[PDB]
Amino acid sequence: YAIPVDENGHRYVGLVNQAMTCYLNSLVQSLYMTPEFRNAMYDKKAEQSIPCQLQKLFLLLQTSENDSLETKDLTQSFGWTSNEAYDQHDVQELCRLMFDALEHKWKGTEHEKLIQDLYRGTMEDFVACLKCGRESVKTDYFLDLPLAVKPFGAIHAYKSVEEALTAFVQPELLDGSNQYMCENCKSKQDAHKGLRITQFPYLLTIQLKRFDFDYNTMHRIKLNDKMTFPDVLDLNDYVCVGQPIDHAAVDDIVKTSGDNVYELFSVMVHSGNAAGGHYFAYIKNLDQDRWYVFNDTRVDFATPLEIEKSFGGHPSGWNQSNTNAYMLMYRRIDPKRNARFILSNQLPQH
Amino acid sequence: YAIPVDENGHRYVGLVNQAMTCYLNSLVQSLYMTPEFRNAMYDKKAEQSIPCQLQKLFLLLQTSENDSLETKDLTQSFGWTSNEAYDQHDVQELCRLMFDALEHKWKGTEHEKLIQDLYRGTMEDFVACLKCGRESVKTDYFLDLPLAVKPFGAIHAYKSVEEALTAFVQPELLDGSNQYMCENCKSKQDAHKGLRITQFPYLLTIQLKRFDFDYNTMHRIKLNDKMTFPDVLDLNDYVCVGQPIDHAAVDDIVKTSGDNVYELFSVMVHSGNAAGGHYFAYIKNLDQDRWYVFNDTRVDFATPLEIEKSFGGHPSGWNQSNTNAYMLMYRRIDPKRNARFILSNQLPQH
Ligand SMILES: [Zn+2]
Ligand SMILES: [Zn+2]
Contact B25, B294 (CB under 8 A): yes
Contact A14, A350 (CB under 8 A): no
Domain regions of chain A by residue span: 14-346
- Burial status of residue A68 (CB atoms within 10 A of its CB: 0-12, 13-18, 19 or more): middle
Contact B308, B323 (CB under 8 A): no
Sheet (strand B121-129) strand order: B135-142, B121-129, B191-199, B172-174
Nearest to B71 by CA among B8, B102, B27: B27
Element (H, E) at B236: none
Nearest to B63 by CA among B2, B3, B4, B12: B12
Nearest to A283 by CA among A275, A272, A295, A297: A295
User: Which ligand has an atom closest to residue A192 CA?
Assistant: 1
DSSP letters for B100-145: HHHHHHSTTSTTTTHHHHHH-EEEEEEEEETTT--EEEEEEEES-E
Contact residues, A window 110-129, toward B, CB-based 8 Å cutoff: 127
Report domain A14-346's class: alpha beta
Q: Which of A22, A270, A314, A350 is catalytic?
A: A22
C-alpha to C-alpha distance for A226 and A251, rounded to whole angstroms: 26
Which residue in A157, A172, A313 is closest to B150 by CB distance?
Answer: A172
Contact A194, A128 (CB under 8 A): no
Pairing of strands A220-222, A323-332: unpaired
* Nearest C-alpha in A relative to B181: A316
For residue A226, which residues of chain B lie inside 8 Å, CB to CB?
A: 177-178
Nearest to A232 by CA among A265, A267, A200: A265
Task: Using a CB–CB cutoff of 8 Å, tell me whether B177 touches chain A.
Answer: yes
Nearest to A317 by CA among B179, B129, B136: B136
* Nearest C-alpha in A relative to B144: A216
> Active site includes B104?
no
**Beta-carbon contacts of residue B155 (< 8 Å; ≥ 6 apart):** A170, A171, A172, A173
Separation of CA B116 and ligand 1 centre (Å): 51
List the beta bridge partners of residue B300. B293
Element (H, E) at A97: helix A91-105
* Nearest C-alpha in A relative to B148: A152
Other Cβ atoms less than 10 A from the Cβ of B257: the count is 10
Contact A4, A12 (CB under 8 A): yes
Pairing of strands B220-222, B187-189: unpaired
**Beta-carbon contacts of residue A7 (< 8 Å; ≥ 6 apart):** A285, A287, A288, A340, A341, A343
Nearest to B73 by CA among B21, B11, B37, B13: B21
C-alpha to C-alpha distance for A324 and A314, rounded to whole angstroms: 10
Instruction: Identify the DSSP state of A129.
Output: E
A&B contacts, CB < 8 Å:
146
Separation of CA A178 and ligand 1 centre (Å): 15
Dihedrals φ, ψ of B167, to 5°? -65, -25
Angle at B145 between CA A180 and CA B259, to 5 degrees: 110
Task: Using a CB–CB cutoff of 8 Å, tell me whether A139 touches chain B.
Answer: no
Separation of CA A179 and ligand 1 centre (Å): 11
C-alpha to C-alpha distance for A90 and B215, rounded to whole angstroms: 10
Instruction: Identify the DSSP state of A202.
Output: S
Long-range contacts of A56-62 (CB under 8 A, 24+ apart): A57/A28, A57/A32, A58/A32, A59/A347, A59/A350, A60/A13, A61/A13, A61/A29, A61/A32, A62/A6, A62/A8, A62/A10, A62/A32, A62/A38, A62/A344
User: A215 vs B93: CB contact, 8 Å cut-off?
Assistant: yes
**CA distance to partner chain B, nearest, from residue A185 (Å):** 10
Separation of CA B124 and ligand 2 centre (Å): 19
For residue B191, which residues of chain A lie inside 8 Å, CB to CB?
A: 314
> Active site includes A22?
yes
Task: Using a CB–CB cutoff of 8 Å, tell me whether B152 touches chain A.
Answer: yes
* One-letter identity of residue B200: F
Separation of CA A264 and ligand 2 centre (Å): 36
**CA distance to partner chain B, nearest, from residue A114 (Å):** 17
Contact B197, B123 (CB under 8 A): yes
Contact A37, A31 (CB under 8 A): yes
Task: Using a CB–CB cutoff of 8 Å, tell me whether A222 touches chain B.
Answer: no
Separation of CA B165 and ligand 2 centre (Å): 28
C-alpha to C-alpha distance for B95 and B92, rounded to whole angstroms: 5
Instruction: Identify the DSSP state of A276.
Output: S
C-alpha to C-alpha distance for A344 and A9, rounded to whole angstroms: 10
Task: Using a CB–CB cutoff of 8 Å, tell me whether B221 touches chain A.
Answer: no
Task: Using a CB–CB cutoff of 8 Å, tell me whether B151 touches chain A.
Answer: yes
Number of residues in chain A: 350
Task: Using a CB–CB cutoff of 8 Å, tell me whether B318 touches chain A.
Answer: yes
* Nearest C-alpha in B relative to A159: B177
Task: Using a CB–CB cutoff of 8 Å, tell me whether B186 touches chain A.
Answer: no
Report domain B14-120+201-346's class: alpha beta
Which residue in B142, B152, B181 is closest to A216 by CB distance?
Answer: B142
Contact residues, B window 189-218, toward A, CB-based 8 Å cutoff: 191, 193, 209, 215-216, 218
User: B216 vs A154: CB contact, 8 Å cut-off?
Assistant: no
Break positions in chain B: residue before each gap, C to N over 2.5 angstroms? 43, 239
Contact A259, A236 (CB under 8 A): yes
Q: What is the resolution of this structure in A?
A: 2.6
Pairing of strands A298-301, A232-234: unpaired
Nearest to A205 by CA among A264, A283, A287: A264
**CA distance to partner chain B, nearest, from residue A169 (Å):** 8
C-alpha to C-alpha distance for B155 and A193, rounded to whole angstroms: 9
* One-letter identity of residue B172: E
**CA distance to partner chain B, nearest, from residue A291 (Å):** 25
DSSP letters for A4-38: -B-TTS-B--EE---SS-TTHHHHHHHHHT-HHHH
Task: Using a CB–CB cutoff of 8 Å, tell me whether A179 touches chain B.
Answer: yes
